[PDB]
Design a protein around this ligand. Structure first.
Ligand SMILES: NCCC(=O)NCCc1cnc[nH]1
Length: 213
């Protein structure tokens, strides 16, 4: 059985976390696949490197170790939704985060509690490529169990996230997240009038989830 341990994010974890996040969102990503081409492996390392110190300082993120190998197999990058770093993303990933803000912004700032230390934004969650289905399913449950524990320990009012893959969306629903938006990603219009995910099927959703803790 997979034996896992959730360790808070340390500064030395940068390259291990970047590898996992690139693996989970490069050509495997449900939104990034439609921005092909022009999205390189380094675009997510660039974002993570720009926010790495603040991400570790906020002490809201953790990595998941396989205690049998003492290697990181998963990570949950979290921020206070009302206290996130300012990112000038100079890649095509700007459309992704502008789309996520398009999904989150209106709901966050109008229907979610006001003030800091209220909204725990589970904005990124990744697992290692080597994980087989069982290891991945088990690691996803472990990270969900831990973001709740971190949310309660850090005294947040609830967990807030936009789930962009069918697996994370289903996990959120069986974990009793409330659905606050079920948006069809091929209907989102970029600033230039185009639909960056217009080639995605109608069935691909960006679901904004929220569970009070
Ligand atoms: N509870 C899961 C949160 C998560 O990992 N969401 C990823 C959304 C995303 C896609 N591309 C950039 N961000």
């Amino acid at each position: 059985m997979l034996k896992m341990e959730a360790v808070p994010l340390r500064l030395e974890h940068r390259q291990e976390v970047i590898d996992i996040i690139v693996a989970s969102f490069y050509n495997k990503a449900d939104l990034e696949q439609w921005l092909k081409p022009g999205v390189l492996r380094t675009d997510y390392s660039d974002i993570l490197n720009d926010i790495w110190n603040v991400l570790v300082e906020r002490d809201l993120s953790f990595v998941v170790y396989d205690t049998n190998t003492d290697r990181i197999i998963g990570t949950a990058l979290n921020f206070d939704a009302r206290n996130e770093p300012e990112v000038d993303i100079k890649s095509k990933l700007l459309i992704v985060f502008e789309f996520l803000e398009f999904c989150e912004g209106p709901i966050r700032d109008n229907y979610l509690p006001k003030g800091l230390n209220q909204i725990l934004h589970s904005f990124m969650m990744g697992t290692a490529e080597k994980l087989n289905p069982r290891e991945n399913i088990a690691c996803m449950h472990f990270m969900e169990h831990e973001v709740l524990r971190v949310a309660r320990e850090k005294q947040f009012a609830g967990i807030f996230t936009t789930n962009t893959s069918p697996l994370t969306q289903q996990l959120a629903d069986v974990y009793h997240y409330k659905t606050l938006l079920n948006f069809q990603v091929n209907e989102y219009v970029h600033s230039d009038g185009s639909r960056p995910f217009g080639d995605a099927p109608d069935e691909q959703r960006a679901i904004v989830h929220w569970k009070e803790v």
